[PDB]
Ligand binder design. Structure first.
Ligand SMILES: COC(=O)[C@H](Cc1cccc(C(=N)N)c1)NC(=O)CNS(=O)(=O)c1ccc(C)cc1
Ligand SMILES: [Ca+2]
Length: 223
């Protein structure tokens, strides 16, 4: 997260860390046994860490659970990152509480100008590198599709949306991928891609979750 603020211990209870010997992507807990992340975060031997704040220090509210099955979206295109969404099922159900809680799926798609919460343990520098140990947060509004294309020249699909500031300075970054974008109390996006970080006229691009609710529900009810 570039230009954000320290969230505060366990203030984002649905935020998860994907670990394969080290943190490599974020994700969101949608129920006691399922996690949603980005398909480009796919990897074998994934361990899900819940209740995390400082990812390098056992603080007491963590739950480390191995994944038993990973399901990348059937139409994921790694070249364009269209349909950049993936489902991860935990070996055993997590114990839900104040510090470990699920986030609800949307019933409608968020609209332009809506303020959302983006979070992750990603890089905090637009130039160079600096990775934080604690969870960072950022408030950012959804942008209109035309305004996004006009300024960035990005080729967006109907399964993506832009959020951030055309002025630059604030944005998600390397390592935040797979993480949550929450608006109106529901999971509306997944950190997917961008061009550099916090660059002017180059806002972040996120997977539009409201288009995948049906797929998610059907997959979870049968796996
Ligand atoms: C990979 O290194 C980076 O600094 C960022 C990471 C990132 C990830 C998710 C969201 C954001 C964000 N801005 N909100 C940033 N991505 C890039 O800079 C990738 N763009 S790119 O122009 O470098 C590029 C384009 C196409 C290919 C095949 C490879 C690389
Ligand atoms: Ca910890």
């Amino acid at each position: 997260i570039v230009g954000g603020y320290t969230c505060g211990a366990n203030t984002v209870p649905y935020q998860v860390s994907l670990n394969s010997g080290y943190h490599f992507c974020g994700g969101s807990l949608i129920n006691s046994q399922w996690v949603v992340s980005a398909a480009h975060c796919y990897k074998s031997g994934i361990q899900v860490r819940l209740g995390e704040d400082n990812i390098n220090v056992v603080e007491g509210n963590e739950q480390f659970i191995s994944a038993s099955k990973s399901i990348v979206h059937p139409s994921y295109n790694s070249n364009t990152l269209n349909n950049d969404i993936m489902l991860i099922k935990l070996k055993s159900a997590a114990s839900l509480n104040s510090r470990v809680a699920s986030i609800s799926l949307p019933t409608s798609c968020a609209s332009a100008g809506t303020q959302c919460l983006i979070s992750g343990w990603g890089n905090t520098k637009s130039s160079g590198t600096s990775y934080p140990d604690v969870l960072k947060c950022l408030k950012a509004p959804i942008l209109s599709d035309s305004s996004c294309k006009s300024a960035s020249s990005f080729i967006i699909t109907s399964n993506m949306f832009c959020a951030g500031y055309l002025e630059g300075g604030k944005d998600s970054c390397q390592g935040d991928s797979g993480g949550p974008v929450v608006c109106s109390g529901k999971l509306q996006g997944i950190v997917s891609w961008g061009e550099g970080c916090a660059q002017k006229n180059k806002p972040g691009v996120y997977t539009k979750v409201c288009n995948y609710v049906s797929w998610i529900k059907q997959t979870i009810a049968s796996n």
